[PDB]
């Protein structure tokens, strides 16, 4: 039960059979003995770097601010950011440079990430606002229906007159008291809330999720997401070559497909997107961390034959990027086209944030 | 810009209390909150999972999804045992545990 209740500490015997299993079990040798799973911190998921492998140059550490190249390394071509870079409030205040992978899995040129996007340092309250938004939004609201007292179909009459009987005082037994009845205030979709999100919070929370992925070394940048044929096993071929793990049980992959550096697209690359349907753990999302402003055309009651929920009539579409799917799939794969689109659509946003004495030097600084 | 109500995250469908909200979704009238709870002393079924909410990623044969316990369908072979290994459905042989030399030995369940 709860730790405090006397129910806890029941089962003073029997919980174990006293006899070891003759296979798996063993005695504790001493302090020099490495126990499987044993770790000094409360890790709910005790993944090491063998089970949930990471790609970045360095295994993320307290000594390193982040696990990527801090300065462009002389043996690889270095591409600078698409738009110039300004350091705003919650940004890392450091150079972040990530290697770009080919589709044959060797490294090709190195590319610099924008600290306003991949450098926004994560703090849990914001990620919370994001996540609960998602999990509430993603229910099926049409199934939340239930029967109400007026919906029951009995006769409306006093079913027996109350005077001298020892019976209960009853009329019209279609109430909630009765096995066949239904409630006064039942559940039904139009009374269930769909939360509004504000574009600011969606922006900031998403960017912190990206940065969280980057600080864990779970981030990977790629030339193009492309297949030879639209088929599935070409996609599974690809996934085998890049050591992406798409099995249901293994840590999955989250694809942001933007197209390549030279030819960025809003649209999914057809060949990839078609073969990308595979029963395992993987997802493909649009290359935007923003969202349209949400609106309500019954903010009061006005339209009564609305089925709907109450709330934003414009909820974030499912294939977008969010905290939930960033948590559930570990390796996040982003195409350069998507990098470019992010930087571009976020640019004037990040500019409008700056304090006015800085903003005035912007045209002078180029 | 009020954060999404946390109670509504779906992890929770309590049974219709005194206190609640207009946006709190409680369960249907006349349907209990925990499925295996037919009585108050009713036990958690052992290896039997009930997938709930989302579609399951892997669906064992001996588990429940939009279903009832149908036994001929649920375990086709009783002498066999079902488990998820390396993200696949797999079937070993059911073993029973028996104390022997002071240790616990696995023997074939069926015979």
């Amino acid at each position: 039960s709860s730790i405090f209740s006397p129910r806890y500490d029941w089962r003073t015997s029997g919980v174990h059979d006293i006899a070891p299993r003759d296979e798996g079990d063993f005695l504790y040798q001493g302090p020099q003995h490495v126990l499987p799973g044993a770790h000094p911190l409360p890790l709910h998921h005790p993944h090491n770097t063998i089970t949930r492998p990471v790609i970045s140059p360095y295994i993320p550490s307290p000594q390193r601010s982040h696990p990527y190249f801090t300065a462009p390394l002389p043996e690889l071509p270095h591409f600078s950011t698409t738009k110039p870079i300004v350091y705003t409030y919650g940004t890392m205040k450091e150079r972040i440079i990530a290697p770009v992978f080919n589709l044959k899995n060797e490294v090709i040129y190195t590319r610099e990430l924008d600290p306003f996007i991949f450098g926004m340092y994560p703090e849990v309250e914001e990620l919370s606002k994001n996540l609960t938004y998602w999990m509430v939004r993603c229910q099926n609201f049409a199934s939340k229906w239930d029967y109400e007292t007026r919906e029951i179909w009995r006769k409306a009459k006093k079913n027996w007159p109350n005077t001298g009987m020892g019976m209960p005082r009853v009329g019209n037994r279609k109430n909630h008291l009765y096995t066949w009845g239904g409630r006064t205030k039942p559940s039904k979709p139009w009374n269930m809330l769909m939360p509004t999100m504000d574009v600011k919070t969606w922006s900031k929370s998403n960017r912190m999720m990206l940065t969280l992925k980057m600080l864990q070394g779970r981030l990977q940048v790629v030339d193009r997401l492309t297949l030879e044929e639209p088929t599935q096993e070409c996609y599974l071929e690809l996934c085998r070559n890049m050591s992406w793990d798409v099995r249901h049980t293994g840590g999955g992959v989250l694809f942001m497909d933007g197209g390549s550096r030279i030819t960025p697209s809003s649209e999914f690359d057809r060949a990839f997107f078609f073969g990308s349907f595979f029963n395992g753990r993987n997802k493909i999302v649009r290359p935007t961390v923003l969202c349209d402003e949400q609106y309500d055309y019954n903010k009061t009651a006005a339209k009564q034959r609305m089925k709907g929920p109450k709330g934003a009539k414009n909820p974030i579409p499912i294939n977008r990027f969010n905290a939930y799917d960033a948590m559930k799939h570990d390796r996040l794969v982003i195409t350069e086209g998507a990098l470019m689109q992010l930087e571009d659509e976020l640019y004037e946003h990040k500019l409008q944030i700056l304090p006015p004495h800085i903003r005035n030097q912007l045209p002078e600084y180029g | 810009p009020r954060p999404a109500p946390r109670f509504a995250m779906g992890h929770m469908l309590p049974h219709r209390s005194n206190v609640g909200s207009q946006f709190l979704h409680t369960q249907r009238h006349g349907s209990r909150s925990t499925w295996y709870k037919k009585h108050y002393f009713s036990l958690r079924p052992f290896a039997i999972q009930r997938h709930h909410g989302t579609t399951p990623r892997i669906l064992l044969d001996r588990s429940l999804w939009k279903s009832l316990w149908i036994t001929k369908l649920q375990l086709p072979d009783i002498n066999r045992w079902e488990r998820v290994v390396n993200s696949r459905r797999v079937t070993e042989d059911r073993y029973a545990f028996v104390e022997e030399e002071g240790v616990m030995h696995k023997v074939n369940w069926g015979l």
């Binding site: 029967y147 109400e148 007026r150 919906e151 029951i152 179909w153 009995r154 279609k174 096995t179 066949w180 009845g181 239904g182 039904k188 139009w190 009374n191 009061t300 009651a301 006005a302 009564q304 034959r305 609305m306 | 009238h29 006349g30």
Partner: peptide, 22 residues
Amino acid sequence: PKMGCEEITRKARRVQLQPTEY
């Protein structure tokens, strides 16, 4: 409302979304 119910098996009324105050 129960599966076998004769009550809800014959459809009675269906409550709308009720209108809010000024």
